[PDB]
Design a protein around this motif. Structure first.
Motif, PDB file in Angstrom:
ATOM      1  N   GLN A   7       0.823  -1.202   0.000  1.00  0.00           N
ATOM      2  CA  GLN A   7       0.000   0.000   0.000  1.00  0.00           C
ATOM      3  C   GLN A   7       0.860   1.256   0.000  1.00  0.00           C
ATOM      4  O   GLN A   7       0.361   2.350  -0.224  1.00  0.00           O
ATOM      5  N   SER A   8       2.147   1.093   0.263  1.00  0.00           N
ATOM      6  CA  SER A   8       3.069   2.213   0.261  1.00  0.00           C
ATOM      7  C   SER A   8       3.087   2.893  -1.101  1.00  0.00           C
ATOM      8  O   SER A   8       2.979   4.112  -1.193  1.00  0.00           O
ATOM      9  N   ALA A   9       3.170   2.097  -2.162  1.00  0.00           N
ATOM     10  CA  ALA A   9       3.191   2.635  -3.518  1.00  0.00           C
ATOM     11  C   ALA A   9       1.860   3.296  -3.842  1.00  0.00           C
ATOM     12  O   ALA A   9       1.793   4.250  -4.615  1.00  0.00           O
ATOM     13  N   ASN A  10       0.809   2.788  -3.223  1.00  0.00           N
ATOM     14  CA  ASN A  10      -0.521   3.360  -3.371  1.00  0.00           C
ATOM     15  C   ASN A  10      -0.609   4.670  -2.602  1.00  0.00           C
ATOM     16  O   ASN A  10      -1.173   5.650  -3.092  1.00  0.00           O
ATOM     17  N   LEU A  11      -0.028   4.692  -1.403  1.00  0.00           N
ATOM     18  CA  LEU A  11      -0.035   5.889  -0.579  1.00  0.00           C
ATOM     19  C   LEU A  11       0.833   6.970  -1.207  1.00  0.00           C
ATOM     20  O   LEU A  11       0.586   8.151  -1.027  1.00  0.00           O
ATOM     21  N   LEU A  12       1.847   6.554  -1.952  1.00  0.00           N
ATOM     22  CA  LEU A  12       2.703   7.487  -2.677  1.00  0.00           C
ATOM     23  C   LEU A  12       1.878   8.378  -3.595  1.00  0.00           C
ATOM     24  O   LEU A  12       2.043   9.598  -3.607  1.00  0.00           O
ATOM     25  N   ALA A  13       1.002   7.760  -4.371  1.00  0.00           N
ATOM     26  CA  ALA A  13       0.104   8.497  -5.245  1.00  0.00           C
ATOM     27  C   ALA A  13      -0.997   9.193  -4.446  1.00  0.00           C
ATOM     28  O   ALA A  13      -1.329  10.350  -4.701  1.00  0.00           O
ATOM     29  N   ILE A  34       3.269   6.364   8.190  1.00  0.00           N
ATOM     30  CA  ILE A  34       4.267   5.351   8.523  1.00  0.00           C
ATOM     31  C   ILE A  34       3.591   4.029   8.880  1.00  0.00           C
ATOM     32  O   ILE A  34       4.005   2.958   8.431  1.00  0.00           O
ATOM     33  N   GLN A  35       2.525   4.123   9.661  1.00  0.00           N
ATOM     34  CA  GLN A  35       1.773   2.950  10.079  1.00  0.00           C
ATOM     35  C   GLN A  35       0.954   2.383   8.925  1.00  0.00           C
ATOM     36  O   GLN A  35       0.690   1.187   8.868  1.00  0.00           O
ATOM     37  N   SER A  36       0.580   3.248   7.999  1.00  0.00           N
ATOM     38  CA  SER A  36      -0.279   2.860   6.885  1.00  0.00           C
ATOM     39  C   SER A  36       0.513   2.187   5.763  1.00  0.00           C
ATOM     40  O   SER A  36      -0.059   1.479   4.935  1.00  0.00           O
ATOM     41  N   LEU A  37       1.823   2.417   5.734  1.00  0.00           N
ATOM     42  CA  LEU A  37       2.687   1.817   4.715  1.00  0.00           C
ATOM     43  C   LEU A  37       2.620   0.304   4.773  1.00  0.00           C
ATOM     44  O   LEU A  37       2.385  -0.365   3.768  1.00  0.00           O
ATOM     45  N   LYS A  38       2.845  -0.224   5.962  1.00  0.00           N
ATOM     46  CA  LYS A  38       2.967  -1.661   6.146  1.00  0.00           C
ATOM     47  C   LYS A  38       1.860  -2.229   7.028  1.00  0.00           C
ATOM     48  O   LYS A  38       1.513  -3.402   6.901  1.00  0.00           O
ATOM     49  N   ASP A  39       1.299  -1.384   7.897  1.00  0.00           N
ATOM     50  CA  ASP A  39       0.329  -1.817   8.910  1.00  0.00           C
ATOM     51  C   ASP A  39       0.928  -2.884   9.811  1.00  0.00           C
ATOM     52  O   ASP A  39       1.545  -2.572  10.832  1.00  0.00           O
ATOM     53  N   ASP A  40       0.763  -4.135   9.415  1.00  0.00           N
ATOM     54  CA  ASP A  40       1.350  -5.254  10.126  1.00  0.00           C
ATOM     55  C   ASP A  40       1.892  -6.257   9.116  1.00  0.00           C
ATOM     56  O   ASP A  40       1.376  -7.363   8.964  1.00  0.00           O
ATOM     57  N   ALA A  41       2.944  -5.848   8.421  1.00  0.00           N
ATOM     58  CA  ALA A  41       3.497  -6.630   7.324  1.00  0.00           C
ATOM     59  C   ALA A  41       4.470  -7.694   7.823  1.00  0.00           C
ATOM     60  O   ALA A  41       5.141  -8.345   7.030  1.00  0.00           O
ATOM     61  N   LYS A  42       4.558  -7.830   9.149  1.00  0.00           N
ATOM     62  CA  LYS A  42       5.361  -8.877   9.804  1.00  0.00           C
ATOM     63  C   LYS A  42       6.868  -8.648   9.639  1.00  0.00           C
ATOM     64  O   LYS A  42       7.677  -9.357  10.239  1.00  0.00           O
TER      65      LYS A  42
END
Length: 63
Positions: A7-13, A34-42
């Motif tokens: 979602q980071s690439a999505n958040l970029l736009a 920052i939290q929205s980039l990965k959320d809980d990507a482990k």
């Protein structure tokens, strides 16, 4: 099949538009990205090394 992109690439736009519409975000706003980039990507080894590159674009822009 566009689910392999973090979602980071999505958040970029998205943040690009969002931030402008908000008239520039304040320092605390970026913590809500920052939290929205990965959320809980482990923290997948290698993958997050890649995520780190996108991370570098969101935590600061004029700095």
């Amino acid at each position: 099949a566009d689910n392999k992109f973090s979602q980071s690439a999505n958040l970029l736009a998205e943040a690009k538009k969002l931030n402008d519409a908000q008239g520039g975000i304040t320092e605390e706003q970026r913590n809500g990205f920052i939290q929205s980039l990965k959320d809980d990507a482990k923290t997948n080894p290698g993958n997050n090394k890649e995520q780190q590159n996108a991370f570098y674009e969101i935590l600061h822009l004029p700095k």
